[PDB]
Amino acid sequence: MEPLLLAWSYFRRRRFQLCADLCTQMLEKSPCDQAAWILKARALTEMVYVDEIDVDEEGIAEMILDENAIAQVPRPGTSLKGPSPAVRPVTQAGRPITGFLRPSTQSGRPGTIEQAIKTPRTAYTARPIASSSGPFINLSRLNLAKYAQKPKLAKALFEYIFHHENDVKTALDLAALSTEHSQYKDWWWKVQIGKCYYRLGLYREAEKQFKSALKQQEMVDTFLYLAKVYISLDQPLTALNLFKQGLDKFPGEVTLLCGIARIYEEMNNISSATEYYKEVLKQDNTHVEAIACIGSNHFYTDQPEVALRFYRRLLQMGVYNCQLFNNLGLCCFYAQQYDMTLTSFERALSLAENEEEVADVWYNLGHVAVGTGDTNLAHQCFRLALVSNNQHAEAYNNLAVLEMRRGHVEQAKALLQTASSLAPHMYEPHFNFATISDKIGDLQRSYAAAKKSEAAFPDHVDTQHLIKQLEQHFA
Amino acid sequence: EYHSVHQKLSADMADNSNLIRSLLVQAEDARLMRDMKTMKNRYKELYDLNKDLLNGYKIRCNNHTELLGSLKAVNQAIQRAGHLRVGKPKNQVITACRDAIRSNNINMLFRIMRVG
């Protein structure tokens, strides 16, 4: 009823528009009221809040122009920098496609600025890469030396400056004055200064504050923060020891086990990431990350029924996506459940909020069709995948395979050239182009294509026989 | 105050270094498409940022050498206090002053340096 009370109760119920809407009134009515002031600050900063732990873009500049790893060429198995590409689709030379895209995924790194620019913008991150990773209150007007004295105001004000305005320097000024006001005895200000540092670039100066905050009071937050810091310095085996220390503190934490599994998958030894995702399951059993990862791994290691179970679980827990339903369709078809197969693809096509998701669903429908026979339906589905996403290399490759099945060799050659131009990291377009060339002749093009195939999937077999035959023809 | 000034300067220089790496990437991009107006503008901005960062380096280094002088003064003062007493009181006074400075209890530091 009353303004302040109704606004605060709107805040408790996570409205975040009404709260501010009543405080703006209550502030116009009285220029001297700090309760509604910091309440509107909280509402504004929480309409946009996103926890700093899972925000690890890094970007193109950090990837090359910033060197922090001590060892330049460390032993294979101690640095971050399964099914073969003949079964599991790939994204780079290696790095098979993963389940559960998270905005911290790097999934390989480019070598030079030119390569990173001249590639698709979303081939090394979940979002397109960036070079660098009225108003309620004007930051240049308030004296942070006076709000630092009042911690009740200072905490919400720092959260506002950091997560709403993204002013790391003024946030760090406020946090420094606040920490010196608390005589360096509250772990929260230490963690916040460490976050300011970590997104300023100073990792060691942030690891110092995170360690000093762990000494004050163990919290899952500081453990994950140190994990991020250590992963940024390219030190997996330090992060794993720190995670096992945290699990010694918190015996069954799910985020710590999930971080261990993420590190094991970045190092690409799935035989332990599955164990740790299974521990996460034994703890949560609704975890979307572990369920999706174990489901994908179960699907690609020729066990599609277990993957269908793992994805029906996510269906049972109210998850309603385009990805989930296309996955259910692939699993139902390949696990030989032909009644619930195509309705899942229909729900997928219904739920797709993009033009690339629609293209992927049409690609998978073409796979279903070509598994059924009737190559014309798959032809149409691949052409629609192209019509939806012009830069869809798998559709080009499959449509060229079907074209050469029909007989049109030049169409297949052009389409395979387009596919291999869009995705060089794939091996199928190169191998097919080399095969058709060798079939007609042109052993130079066959060599230039089979060598790129071997560069893409270096443990292939038919590529090796092709290269042997070619090098034999050259003498 | 030396600590605080160094912290603020390091923050600012980290900001400008991130800016400079972004501008390096942007200039390489503009040069890969032979767009010379934007490339030259990136190079001008890089020149200006390097000038500002060199000024910042000079002032930080200066404050940092002053900070080293102050730290050596403090440590040598603790040592001069301890060195005035023979035997077991020496390390007693040394550790007492170290604990009185880690807790910023300056008055206790001078109390233990005077009689303790």
Side-chain angles (χ1 to χ4, degrees), chain A residues 362-363 365-367 369-370 373-387 395 398-406 408 411 415:
Chain A
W362 275 117
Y363 172 40
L365 275 174
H367 261 294
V370 71
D374 78 325
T375 80
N376 289 315
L377 176 46
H379 200 277
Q380 288 190 7
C381 303
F382 293 139
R383 274 196 161 180
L384 285 154
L386 287 183
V387 122
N398 300 135
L399 181 55
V401 173
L402 286 190
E403 279 286 314
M404 183 52 201
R405 194 79 190 268
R406 280 158 177 242
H408 311 331
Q411 300 278 164
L415 290 158

PDB file of all heavy atoms in Angstrom, chain A residues 362-363 365-367 369-370 373-387 395 398-406 408 411 415:
ATOM      1  N   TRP A 362      16.551 -28.379 -40.706  1.00  0.00           N
ATOM      2  CA  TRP A 362      16.309 -28.892 -42.052  1.00  0.00           C
ATOM      3  C   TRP A 362      17.433 -29.818 -42.501  1.00  0.00           C
ATOM      4  O   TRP A 362      17.192 -30.800 -43.209  1.00  0.00           O
ATOM      5  CB  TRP A 362      16.148 -27.738 -43.035  1.00  0.00           C
ATOM      6  CG  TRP A 362      14.764 -27.208 -43.091  1.00  0.00           C
ATOM      7  CD1 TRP A 362      14.358 -25.954 -42.763  1.00  0.00           C
ATOM      8  CD2 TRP A 362      13.591 -27.919 -43.497  1.00  0.00           C
ATOM      9  NE1 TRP A 362      13.005 -25.835 -42.943  1.00  0.00           N
ATOM     10  CE2 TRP A 362      12.511 -27.032 -43.392  1.00  0.00           C
ATOM     11  CE3 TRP A 362      13.354 -29.221 -43.939  1.00  0.00           C
ATOM     12  CZ2 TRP A 362      11.213 -27.402 -43.715  1.00  0.00           C
ATOM     13  CZ3 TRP A 362      12.069 -29.587 -44.256  1.00  0.00           C
ATOM     14  CH2 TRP A 362      11.013 -28.682 -44.143  1.00  0.00           C
ATOM     15  N   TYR A 363      18.663 -29.518 -42.096  1.00  0.00           N
ATOM     16  CA  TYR A 363      19.788 -30.413 -42.352  1.00  0.00           C
ATOM     17  C   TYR A 363      19.546 -31.780 -41.727  1.00  0.00           C
ATOM     18  O   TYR A 363      19.725 -32.821 -42.375  1.00  0.00           O
ATOM     19  CB  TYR A 363      21.060 -29.768 -41.801  1.00  0.00           C
ATOM     20  CG  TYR A 363      22.278 -30.648 -41.810  1.00  0.00           C
ATOM     21  CD1 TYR A 363      22.543 -31.480 -42.880  1.00  0.00           C
ATOM     22  CD2 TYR A 363      23.167 -30.633 -40.751  1.00  0.00           C
ATOM     23  CE1 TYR A 363      23.647 -32.282 -42.887  1.00  0.00           C
ATOM     24  CE2 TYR A 363      24.280 -31.438 -40.754  1.00  0.00           C
ATOM     25  CZ  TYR A 363      24.514 -32.260 -41.830  1.00  0.00           C
ATOM     26  OH  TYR A 363      25.621 -33.069 -41.847  1.00  0.00           O
ATOM     27  N   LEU A 365      16.658 -33.047 -40.830  1.00  0.00           N
ATOM     28  CA  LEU A 365      15.544 -33.684 -41.522  1.00  0.00           C
ATOM     29  C   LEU A 365      15.993 -34.308 -42.829  1.00  0.00           C
ATOM     30  O   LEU A 365      15.495 -35.371 -43.215  1.00  0.00           O
ATOM     31  CB  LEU A 365      14.433 -32.672 -41.778  1.00  0.00           C
ATOM     32  CG  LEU A 365      13.459 -32.473 -40.624  1.00  0.00           C
ATOM     33  CD1 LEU A 365      12.500 -31.349 -40.940  1.00  0.00           C
ATOM     34  CD2 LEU A 365      12.711 -33.758 -40.376  1.00  0.00           C
ATOM     35  N   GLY A 366      16.933 -33.670 -43.525  1.00  0.00           N
ATOM     36  CA  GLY A 366      17.512 -34.284 -44.705  1.00  0.00           C
ATOM     37  C   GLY A 366      18.303 -35.532 -44.381  1.00  0.00           C
ATOM     38  O   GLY A 366      18.319 -36.482 -45.163  1.00  0.00           O
ATOM     39  N   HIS A 367      18.968 -35.547 -43.226  1.00  0.00           N
ATOM     40  CA  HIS A 367      19.631 -36.771 -42.786  1.00  0.00           C
ATOM     41  C   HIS A 367      18.619 -37.886 -42.538  1.00  0.00           C
ATOM     42  O   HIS A 367      18.832 -39.034 -42.944  1.00  0.00           O
ATOM     43  CB  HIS A 367      20.453 -36.505 -41.529  1.00  0.00           C
ATOM     44  CG  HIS A 367      21.906 -36.292 -41.802  1.00  0.00           C
ATOM     45  ND1 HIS A 367      22.723 -37.290 -42.285  1.00  0.00           N
ATOM     46  CD2 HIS A 367      22.683 -35.196 -41.671  1.00  0.00           C
ATOM     47  CE1 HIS A 367      23.947 -36.817 -42.432  1.00  0.00           C
ATOM     48  NE2 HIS A 367      23.949 -35.549 -42.065  1.00  0.00           N
ATOM     49  N   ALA A 369      15.717 -38.137 -43.958  1.00  0.00           N
ATOM     50  CA  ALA A 369      15.198 -38.522 -45.264  1.00  0.00           C
ATOM     51  C   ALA A 369      16.164 -39.434 -46.008  1.00  0.00           C
ATOM     52  O   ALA A 369      15.749 -40.449 -46.577  1.00  0.00           O
ATOM     53  CB  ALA A 369      14.901 -37.270 -46.086  1.00  0.00           C
ATOM     54  N   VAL A 370      17.455 -39.098 -46.014  1.00  0.00           N
ATOM     55  CA  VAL A 370      18.420 -39.921 -46.729  1.00  0.00           C
ATOM     56  C   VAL A 370      18.637 -41.251 -46.021  1.00  0.00           C
ATOM     57  O   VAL A 370      19.032 -42.232 -46.659  1.00  0.00           O
ATOM     58  CB  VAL A 370      19.756 -39.171 -46.911  1.00  0.00           C
ATOM     59  CG1 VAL A 370      20.486 -39.032 -45.593  1.00  0.00           C
ATOM     60  CG2 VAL A 370      20.620 -39.870 -47.933  1.00  0.00           C
ATOM     61  N   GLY A 373      15.853 -43.267 -47.484  1.00  0.00           N
ATOM     62  CA  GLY A 373      15.872 -43.449 -48.921  1.00  0.00           C
ATOM     63  C   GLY A 373      15.512 -42.149 -49.604  1.00  0.00           C
ATOM     64  O   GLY A 373      16.070 -41.107 -49.254  1.00  0.00           O
ATOM     65  N   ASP A 374      14.618 -42.212 -50.598  1.00  0.00           N
ATOM     66  CA  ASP A 374      13.939 -41.061 -51.204  1.00  0.00           C
ATOM     67  C   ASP A 374      14.821 -39.816 -51.269  1.00  0.00           C
ATOM     68  O   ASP A 374      14.493 -38.763 -50.712  1.00  0.00           O
ATOM     69  CB  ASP A 374      12.588 -40.798 -50.502  1.00  0.00           C
ATOM     70  CG  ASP A 374      12.714 -40.079 -49.164  1.00  0.00           C
ATOM     71  OD1 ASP A 374      13.685 -40.308 -48.423  1.00  0.00           O
ATOM     72  OD2 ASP A 374      11.817 -39.269 -48.854  1.00  0.00           O
ATOM     73  N   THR A 375      15.956 -39.934 -51.964  1.00  0.00           N
ATOM     74  CA  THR A 375      16.965 -38.881 -51.986  1.00  0.00           C
ATOM     75  C   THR A 375      16.419 -37.521 -52.411  1.00  0.00           C
ATOM     76  O   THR A 375      17.087 -36.505 -52.190  1.00  0.00           O
ATOM     77  CB  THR A 375      18.107 -39.282 -52.916  1.00  0.00           C
ATOM     78  OG1 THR A 375      17.733 -39.021 -54.272  1.00  0.00           O
ATOM     79  CG2 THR A 375      18.413 -40.762 -52.762  1.00  0.00           C
ATOM     80  N   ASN A 376      15.226 -37.469 -53.008  1.00  0.00           N
ATOM     81  CA  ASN A 376      14.660 -36.186 -53.411  1.00  0.00           C
ATOM     82  C   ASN A 376      14.244 -35.353 -52.202  1.00  0.00           C
ATOM     83  O   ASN A 376      14.452 -34.133 -52.178  1.00  0.00           O
ATOM     84  CB  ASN A 376      13.472 -36.410 -54.340  1.00  0.00           C
ATOM     85  CG  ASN A 376      13.894 -36.902 -55.704  1.00  0.00           C
ATOM     86  OD1 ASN A 376      14.838 -36.386 -56.295  1.00  0.00           O
ATOM     87  ND2 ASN A 376      13.193 -37.909 -56.210  1.00  0.00           N
ATOM     88  N   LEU A 377      13.649 -35.993 -51.198  1.00  0.00           N
ATOM     89  CA  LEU A 377      13.286 -35.267 -49.989  1.00  0.00           C
ATOM     90  C   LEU A 377      14.523 -34.716 -49.291  1.00  0.00           C
ATOM     91  O   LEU A 377      14.526 -33.565 -48.838  1.00  0.00           O
ATOM     92  CB  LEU A 377      12.491 -36.178 -49.054  1.00  0.00           C
ATOM     93  CG  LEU A 377      12.081 -35.639 -47.683  1.00  0.00           C
ATOM     94  CD1 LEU A 377      11.496 -34.246 -47.782  1.00  0.00           C
ATOM     95  CD2 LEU A 377      11.095 -36.592 -47.032  1.00  0.00           C
ATOM     96  N   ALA A 378      15.593 -35.509 -49.217  1.00  0.00           N
ATOM     97  CA  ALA A 378      16.828 -35.017 -48.620  1.00  0.00           C
ATOM     98  C   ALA A 378      17.434 -33.901 -49.459  1.00  0.00           C
ATOM     99  O   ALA A 378      18.013 -32.957 -48.916  1.00  0.00           O
ATOM    100  CB  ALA A 378      17.825 -36.159 -48.446  1.00  0.00           C
ATOM    101  N   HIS A 379      17.309 -34.000 -50.783  1.00  0.00           N
ATOM    102  CA  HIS A 379      17.741 -32.920 -51.663  1.00  0.00           C
ATOM    103  C   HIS A 379      17.040 -31.617 -51.302  1.00  0.00           C
ATOM    104  O   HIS A 379      17.680 -30.573 -51.133  1.00  0.00           O
ATOM    105  CB  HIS A 379      17.450 -33.309 -53.113  1.00  0.00           C
ATOM    106  CG  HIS A 379      18.242 -32.543 -54.126  1.00  0.00           C
ATOM    107  ND1 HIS A 379      17.873 -31.292 -54.568  1.00  0.00           N
ATOM    108  CD2 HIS A 379      19.365 -32.868 -54.809  1.00  0.00           C
ATOM    109  CE1 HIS A 379      18.747 -30.869 -55.465  1.00  0.00           C
ATOM    110  NE2 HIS A 379      19.662 -31.809 -55.628  1.00  0.00           N
ATOM    111  N   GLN A 380      15.715 -31.674 -51.162  1.00  0.00           N
ATOM    112  CA  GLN A 380      14.956 -30.482 -50.801  1.00  0.00           C
ATOM    113  C   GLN A 380      15.344 -29.967 -49.423  1.00  0.00           C
ATOM    114  O   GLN A 380      15.450 -28.753 -49.216  1.00  0.00           O
ATOM    115  CB  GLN A 380      13.458 -30.773 -50.851  1.00  0.00           C
ATOM    116  CG  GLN A 380      12.906 -30.929 -52.247  1.00  0.00           C
ATOM    117  CD  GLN A 380      11.397 -30.971 -52.262  1.00  0.00           C
ATOM    118  OE1 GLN A 380      10.750 -30.758 -51.240  1.00  0.00           O
ATOM    119  NE2 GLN A 380      10.826 -31.249 -53.424  1.00  0.00           N
ATOM    120  N   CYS A 381      15.561 -30.869 -48.465  1.00  0.00           N
ATOM    121  CA  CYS A 381      15.902 -30.422 -47.118  1.00  0.00           C
ATOM    122  C   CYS A 381      17.272 -29.760 -47.075  1.00  0.00           C
ATOM    123  O   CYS A 381      17.455 -28.748 -46.386  1.00  0.00           O
ATOM    124  CB  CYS A 381      15.838 -31.589 -46.137  1.00  0.00           C
ATOM    125  SG  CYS A 381      14.252 -32.447 -46.077  1.00  0.00           S
ATOM    126  N   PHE A 382      18.247 -30.302 -47.805  1.00  0.00           N
ATOM    127  CA  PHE A 382      19.561 -29.672 -47.856  1.00  0.00           C
ATOM    128  C   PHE A 382      19.494 -28.323 -48.560  1.00  0.00           C
ATOM    129  O   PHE A 382      20.132 -27.354 -48.122  1.00  0.00           O
ATOM    130  CB  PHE A 382      20.563 -30.589 -48.550  1.00  0.00           C
ATOM    131  CG  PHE A 382      20.866 -31.844 -47.788  1.00  0.00           C
ATOM    132  CD1 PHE A 382      20.978 -33.057 -48.439  1.00  0.00           C
ATOM    133  CD2 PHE A 382      21.052 -31.803 -46.419  1.00  0.00           C
ATOM    134  CE1 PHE A 382      21.258 -34.205 -47.742  1.00  0.00           C
ATOM    135  CE2 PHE A 382      21.332 -32.952 -45.721  1.00  0.00           C
ATOM    136  CZ  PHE A 382      21.434 -34.153 -46.381  1.00  0.00           C
ATOM    137  N   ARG A 383      18.720 -28.234 -49.644  1.00  0.00           N
ATOM    138  CA  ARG A 383      18.579 -26.948 -50.315  1.00  0.00           C
ATOM    139  C   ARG A 383      17.890 -25.928 -49.423  1.00  0.00           C
ATOM    140  O   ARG A 383      18.213 -24.739 -49.478  1.00  0.00           O
ATOM    141  CB  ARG A 383      17.820 -27.118 -51.627  1.00  0.00           C
ATOM    142  CG  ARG A 383      18.718 -27.491 -52.784  1.00  0.00           C
ATOM    143  CD  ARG A 383      18.039 -27.291 -54.121  1.00  0.00           C
ATOM    144  NE  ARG A 383      19.016 -27.227 -55.199  1.00  0.00           N
ATOM    145  CZ  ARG A 383      18.703 -27.052 -56.479  1.00  0.00           C
ATOM    146  NH1 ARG A 383      17.437 -26.920 -56.845  1.00  0.00           N
ATOM    147  NH2 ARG A 383      19.665 -27.005 -57.394  1.00  0.00           N
ATOM    148  N   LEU A 384      16.964 -26.369 -48.569  1.00  0.00           N
ATOM    149  CA  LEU A 384      16.325 -25.441 -47.644  1.00  0.00           C
ATOM    150  C   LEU A 384      17.272 -25.027 -46.530  1.00  0.00           C
ATOM    151  O   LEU A 384      17.231 -23.883 -46.065  1.00  0.00           O
ATOM    152  CB  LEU A 384      15.059 -26.062 -47.065  1.00  0.00           C
ATOM    153  CG  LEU A 384      13.902 -26.096 -48.052  1.00  0.00           C
ATOM    154  CD1 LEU A 384      12.953 -27.226 -47.711  1.00  0.00           C
ATOM    155  CD2 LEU A 384      13.200 -24.763 -48.037  1.00  0.00           C
ATOM    156  N   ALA A 385      18.125 -25.948 -46.079  1.00  0.00           N
ATOM    157  CA  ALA A 385      19.164 -25.579 -45.127  1.00  0.00           C
ATOM    158  C   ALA A 385      20.081 -24.522 -45.715  1.00  0.00           C
ATOM    159  O   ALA A 385      20.541 -23.622 -45.008  1.00  0.00           O
ATOM    160  CB  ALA A 385      19.964 -26.812 -44.717  1.00  0.00           C
ATOM    161  N   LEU A 386      20.356 -24.620 -47.016  1.00  0.00           N
ATOM    162  CA  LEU A 386      21.142 -23.589 -47.685  1.00  0.00           C
ATOM    163  C   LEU A 386      20.369 -22.277 -47.778  1.00  0.00           C
ATOM    164  O   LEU A 386      20.933 -21.197 -47.567  1.00  0.00           O
ATOM    165  CB  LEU A 386      21.558 -24.072 -49.071  1.00  0.00           C
ATOM    166  CG  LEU A 386      22.641 -25.141 -49.036  1.00  0.00           C
ATOM    167  CD1 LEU A 386      23.050 -25.520 -50.439  1.00  0.00           C
ATOM    168  CD2 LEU A 386      23.824 -24.636 -48.249  1.00  0.00           C
ATOM    169  N   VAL A 387      19.087 -22.370 -48.114  1.00  0.00           N
ATOM    170  CA  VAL A 387      18.244 -21.189 -48.257  1.00  0.00           C
ATOM    171  C   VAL A 387      18.078 -20.434 -46.942  1.00  0.00           C
ATOM    172  O   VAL A 387      17.820 -19.232 -46.933  1.00  0.00           O
ATOM    173  CB  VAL A 387      16.864 -21.549 -48.851  1.00  0.00           C
ATOM    174  CG1 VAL A 387      15.734 -21.136 -47.920  1.00  0.00           C
ATOM    175  CG2 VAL A 387      16.694 -20.913 -50.221  1.00  0.00           C
ATOM    176  N   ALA A 395      25.567 -28.794 -45.464  1.00  0.00           N
ATOM    177  CA  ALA A 395      24.519 -28.875 -46.472  1.00  0.00           C
ATOM    178  C   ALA A 395      25.110 -28.885 -47.873  1.00  0.00           C
ATOM    179  O   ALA A 395      24.669 -29.652 -48.731  1.00  0.00           O
ATOM    180  CB  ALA A 395      23.540 -27.718 -46.310  1.00  0.00           C
ATOM    181  N   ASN A 398      26.689 -32.439 -48.450  1.00  0.00           N
ATOM    182  CA  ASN A 398      25.704 -33.500 -48.643  1.00  0.00           C
ATOM    183  C   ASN A 398      24.937 -33.323 -49.945  1.00  0.00           C
ATOM    184  O   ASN A 398      24.642 -34.302 -50.639  1.00  0.00           O
ATOM    185  CB  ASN A 398      24.752 -33.540 -47.455  1.00  0.00           C
ATOM    186  CG  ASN A 398      25.465 -33.805 -46.164  1.00  0.00           C
ATOM    187  OD1 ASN A 398      25.217 -33.150 -45.165  1.00  0.00           O
ATOM    188  ND2 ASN A 398      26.369 -34.766 -46.179  1.00  0.00           N
ATOM    189  N   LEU A 399      24.598 -32.082 -50.291  1.00  0.00           N
ATOM    190  CA  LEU A 399      23.916 -31.828 -51.547  1.00  0.00           C
ATOM    191  C   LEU A 399      24.812 -32.149 -52.735  1.00  0.00           C
ATOM    192  O   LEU A 399      24.326 -32.631 -53.762  1.00  0.00           O
ATOM    193  CB  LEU A 399      23.456 -30.377 -51.587  1.00  0.00           C
ATOM    194  CG  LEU A 399      22.696 -29.903 -52.813  1.00  0.00           C
ATOM    195  CD1 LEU A 399      21.502 -30.793 -53.051  1.00  0.00           C
ATOM    196  CD2 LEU A 399      22.271 -28.468 -52.608  1.00  0.00           C
ATOM    197  N   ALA A 400      26.122 -31.931 -52.607  1.00  0.00           N
ATOM    198  CA  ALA A 400      27.038 -32.328 -53.667  1.00  0.00           C
ATOM    199  C   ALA A 400      27.162 -33.841 -53.763  1.00  0.00           C
ATOM    200  O   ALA A 400      27.297 -34.382 -54.867  1.00  0.00           O
ATOM    201  CB  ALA A 400      28.406 -31.697 -53.438  1.00  0.00           C
ATOM    202  N   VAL A 401      27.131 -34.536 -52.627  1.00  0.00           N
ATOM    203  CA  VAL A 401      27.123 -35.994 -52.654  1.00  0.00           C
ATOM    204  C   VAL A 401      25.890 -36.504 -53.387  1.00  0.00           C
ATOM    205  O   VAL A 401      25.981 -37.396 -54.237  1.00  0.00           O
ATOM    206  CB  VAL A 401      27.203 -36.562 -51.228  1.00  0.00           C
ATOM    207  CG1 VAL A 401      27.031 -38.067 -51.256  1.00  0.00           C
ATOM    208  CG2 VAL A 401      28.526 -36.204 -50.588  1.00  0.00           C
ATOM    209  N   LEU A 402      24.721 -35.936 -53.087  1.00  0.00           N
ATOM    210  CA  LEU A 402      23.505 -36.357 -53.779  1.00  0.00           C
ATOM    211  C   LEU A 402      23.533 -35.981 -55.258  1.00  0.00           C
ATOM    212  O   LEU A 402      23.023 -36.734 -56.097  1.00  0.00           O
ATOM    213  CB  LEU A 402      22.273 -35.758 -53.107  1.00  0.00           C
ATOM    214  CG  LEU A 402      21.873 -36.374 -51.768  1.00  0.00           C
ATOM    215  CD1 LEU A 402      20.514 -35.858 -51.341  1.00  0.00           C
ATOM    216  CD2 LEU A 402      21.871 -37.889 -51.845  1.00  0.00           C
ATOM    217  N   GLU A 403      24.119 -34.834 -55.597  1.00  0.00           N
ATOM    218  CA  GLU A 403      24.249 -34.447 -56.998  1.00  0.00           C
ATOM    219  C   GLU A 403      25.112 -35.443 -57.761  1.00  0.00           C
ATOM    220  O   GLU A 403      24.721 -35.931 -58.826  1.00  0.00           O
ATOM    221  CB  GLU A 403      24.826 -33.038 -57.100  1.00  0.00           C
ATOM    222  CG  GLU A 403      23.802 -31.944 -56.905  1.00  0.00           C
ATOM    223  CD  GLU A 403      22.888 -31.789 -58.102  1.00  0.00           C
ATOM    224  OE1 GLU A 403      23.400 -31.768 -59.241  1.00  0.00           O
ATOM    225  OE2 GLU A 403      21.659 -31.688 -57.912  1.00  0.00           O
ATOM    226  N   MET A 404      26.303 -35.749 -57.238  1.00  0.00           N
ATOM    227  CA  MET A 404      27.146 -36.749 -57.877  1.00  0.00           C
ATOM    228  C   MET A 404      26.489 -38.123 -57.891  1.00  0.00           C
ATOM    229  O   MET A 404      26.774 -38.928 -58.781  1.00  0.00           O
ATOM    230  CB  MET A 404      28.507 -36.816 -57.185  1.00  0.00           C
ATOM    231  CG  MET A 404      29.476 -37.790 -57.821  1.00  0.00           C
ATOM    232  SD  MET A 404      29.663 -37.519 -59.587  1.00  0.00           S
ATOM    233  CE  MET A 404      30.290 -39.118 -60.103  1.00  0.00           C
ATOM    234  N   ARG A 405      25.606 -38.403 -56.932  1.00  0.00           N
ATOM    235  CA  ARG A 405      24.785 -39.602 -57.020  1.00  0.00           C
ATOM    236  C   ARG A 405      23.882 -39.545 -58.247  1.00  0.00           C
ATOM    237  O   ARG A 405      23.720 -40.543 -58.955  1.00  0.00           O
ATOM    238  CB  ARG A 405      23.954 -39.762 -55.746  1.00  0.00           C
ATOM    239  CG  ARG A 405      23.312 -41.127 -55.577  1.00  0.00           C
ATOM    240  CD  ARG A 405      24.319 -42.146 -55.077  1.00  0.00           C
ATOM    241  NE  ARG A 405      23.790 -43.505 -55.130  1.00  0.00           N
ATOM    242  CZ  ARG A 405      23.157 -44.099 -54.125  1.00  0.00           C
ATOM    243  NH1 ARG A 405      22.967 -43.456 -52.985  1.00  0.00           N
ATOM    244  NH2 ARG A 405      22.714 -45.342 -54.263  1.00  0.00           N
ATOM    245  N   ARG A 406      23.285 -38.380 -58.509  1.00  0.00           N
ATOM    246  CA  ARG A 406      22.478 -38.211 -59.713  1.00  0.00           C
ATOM    247  C   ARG A 406      23.338 -38.296 -60.968  1.00  0.00           C
ATOM    248  O   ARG A 406      22.982 -38.982 -61.935  1.00  0.00           O
ATOM    249  CB  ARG A 406      21.729 -36.882 -59.665  1.00  0.00           C
ATOM    250  CG  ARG A 406      20.483 -36.911 -58.806  1.00  0.00           C
ATOM    251  CD  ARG A 406      20.081 -35.519 -58.353  1.00  0.00           C
ATOM    252  NE  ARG A 406      18.847 -35.544 -57.578  1.00  0.00           N
ATOM    253  CZ  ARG A 406      17.726 -34.927 -57.939  1.00  0.00           C
ATOM    254  NH1 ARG A 406      17.686 -34.235 -59.070  1.00  0.00           N
ATOM    255  NH2 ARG A 406      16.648 -35.005 -57.174  1.00  0.00           N
ATOM    256  N   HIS A 408      25.488 -35.236 -61.919  1.00  0.00           N
ATOM    257  CA  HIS A 408      25.991 -33.908 -62.251  1.00  0.00           C
ATOM    258  C   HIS A 408      27.315 -33.633 -61.549  1.00  0.00           C
ATOM    259  O   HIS A 408      27.337 -33.188 -60.398  1.00  0.00           O
ATOM    260  CB  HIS A 408      24.956 -32.846 -61.882  1.00  0.00           C
ATOM    261  CG  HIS A 408      23.577 -33.150 -62.377  1.00  0.00           C
ATOM    262  ND1 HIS A 408      23.344 -33.892 -63.515  1.00  0.00           N
ATOM    263  CD2 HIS A 408      22.360 -32.819 -61.887  1.00  0.00           C
ATOM    264  CE1 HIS A 408      22.043 -34.002 -63.704  1.00  0.00           C
ATOM    265  NE2 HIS A 408      21.421 -33.363 -62.731  1.00  0.00           N
ATOM    266  N   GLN A 411      28.326 -29.673 -60.805  1.00  0.00           N
ATOM    267  CA  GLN A 411      27.593 -29.150 -59.659  1.00  0.00           C
ATOM    268  C   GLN A 411      28.214 -29.633 -58.356  1.00  0.00           C
ATOM    269  O   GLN A 411      28.414 -28.851 -57.419  1.00  0.00           O
ATOM    270  CB  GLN A 411      26.128 -29.571 -59.749  1.00  0.00           C
ATOM    271  CG  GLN A 411      25.421 -29.088 -60.992  1.00  0.00           C
ATOM    272  CD  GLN A 411      24.942 -27.659 -60.864  1.00  0.00           C
ATOM    273  OE1 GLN A 411      24.622 -27.008 -61.858  1.00  0.00           O
ATOM    274  NE2 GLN A 411      24.890 -27.161 -59.633  1.00  0.00           N
ATOM    275  N   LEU A 415      29.960 -27.298 -55.472  1.00  0.00           N
ATOM    276  CA  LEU A 415      29.406 -27.290 -54.126  1.00  0.00           C
ATOM    277  C   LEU A 415      30.435 -27.746 -53.098  1.00  0.00           C
ATOM    278  O   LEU A 415      30.501 -27.200 -51.992  1.00  0.00           O
ATOM    279  CB  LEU A 415      28.159 -28.164 -54.076  1.00  0.00           C
ATOM    280  CG  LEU A 415      26.947 -27.601 -54.820  1.00  0.00           C
ATOM    281  CD1 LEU A 415      25.973 -28.698 -55.183  1.00  0.00           C
ATOM    282  CD2 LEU A 415      26.262 -26.540 -53.992  1.00  0.00           C
TER     283      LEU A 415
END
